[PDB]
Amino acid sequence: TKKVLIVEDNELNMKLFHDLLEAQGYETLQTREGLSALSIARENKPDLILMDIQLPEISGLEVTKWLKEDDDLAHIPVVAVTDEERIREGGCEAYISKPISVVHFLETIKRLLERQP
Template sequence: MMVKKRSGKVLVVEDNELNMRLFCDLLGAYGFTTFQCRDGAKAVEIARKELPDLIIMDIQLPEVSGLDITRWLKDDKKVAHIPVLAVTAFAMRADEQRVREAGCEGYLSKPIQIASFIRAVEALMPKEPAA
């Protein structure tokens, strides 16, 4: 699948080293700048500092749920506008509903398929990335 190179900043919140590397390598190959966060509690702080165009959020994090972090982001006026793509091993219909109710604009189940991942990122990425 050929996707034109894009610019934009993506915060990846993921505690699994292999998934983190996969997501960042894929995003980098398509021209995106990535910021990594393995600790969910720091995700809001990084989002406020870097103002990414998109946040990719693992739902199963060790200290705090990705759903809680998404709620915190959506309650913060400075970063509430940033779309959140949930990427999770939860794959039941009710799980997607819970993810969307928490404020995530997109949902992908793991293991990801590369084409679907890139399409989801493209769909949620603002047309004009932040400066």
């Protein structure tokens, strides 16, 4: 079972993302803070990180920089939730905007998570 770490401070968004991912058979890890996301990523080794760029305490792009600078976390694909240019240059594999399209969201995640070795 693949694990997705969701970094989102808003309760409603966190719940939507969790529900959608769980319905696909994925397990989720959850946090509202950027620094904690880094700690959780090392402790659990998620397969993908969904990160809200507009966190209240820190920029998601700065958190992504720390991720890419860590040899054990750099390979984990990061999908930004919000730009397209900044996010790409920031190290994120894809971007999802709100109001989010359920199918676009799931297709994006699945394409990154469900590939052959």
